Design a protein around this ligand. Structure first.
Ligand SMILES: [K+]
Lengths: 134, 134, 133
């Protein structure tokens, strides 16, 4: 069967949940967005499974992700009722001052497992502006 | 019963309408997002009911909200068929120059009254970058 | 017939596709968002039809649109089953540094043609901060 409007909204909420949880430093709600064997990849490496995702969460906060607002935009989703791909943008701004922090193109593979959508693979392609890359 | 996809879209449009009406300085469209018992809360305190909401529209514009683009992102909506809660982000940029203006975490309580969604309580938790807070 | 949720989501995806194709410099995916007689209007002028839209795409990239992220937000959509209008915000930021690039108010007229939504007219009202202005 086809992807429903409710499915699309739920998949978009995975991005919103990931980003908000990261900003709040809420590791449990962050981890909930991933499948048990889900993965996060960026220039920094790959974190896969819950233990590595948990460590990765703190590592990202420590290196570049703390004290920001990470915002998702331009979601495009394609797939069916249990497997889909999302492409979107990530823009990052500082909470403590009026500067920007970076941006990225994001590609997500998502899956419906036991009736709920989860991130299988999130790939973040960071734009060259990121201070950690300069 | 559960929220429909159209419900969730309509709830997200409340945020869009609030912010666009504020930026356009369209008081009537701003107020139409609120139920008669509606309230707005932030760093500045709370305004309840349309008399207070109308005055607060001008107060906010005159001190800090004028000349901007207020953008909503990362919407997460929970609820049932006639009551829901929305969590989202607000990022604010200047229309007249290339600077940022601020950001916030936003929590909305909404209700479906005679087939249409309204804001009952909007809580804005502004980030410390807001110039006014300096 | 009223718009369905799938309709509104697809209409939103036209904006996402437009902006993502512009940023990627993917002219074929950009053009696909428009009906054959579709039009884009901005302060720079109006391009109607796919050959004008194609020329306009590269003209924009060569002058102000290259090297950015064009993000859509605050989508409001009104309509029926085959004709709608969308109002939204466009914010633009630089990919190569941490500066902003500009913003705009966007108004789109869209139409469902053979079961798929297309842009008929997109009007971009750029805010005065744009360096090109
Ligand atoms: K920005």
């Amino acid at each position: 069967m086809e992807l429903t409007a409710l499915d699309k909204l739920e998949i978009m909420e995975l991005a919103a949940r990931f980003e908000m949880s990261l900003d709040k430093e809420d590791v449990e709600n962050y981890l909930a967005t991933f499948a048990s064997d889900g993965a996060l990849q960026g220039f920094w490496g790959i974190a896969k499974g819950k233990e590595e995702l948990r460590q990765g969460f703190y590592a990202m906060l420590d290196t570049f992700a703390r004290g920001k607002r990470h915002c998702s935009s331009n979601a495009i989703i394609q797939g069916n009722y249990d497997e889909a791909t999302m492409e979107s943008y990530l823009t990052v701004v500082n909470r403590e001052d009026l500067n920007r922090a970076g941006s990225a193109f994001v590609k997500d593979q998502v899956r419906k497992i036991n009736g709920k959508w989860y991130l299988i693979l999130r790939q973040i392609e960071v734009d060259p502006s990121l201070p950690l890359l300069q």
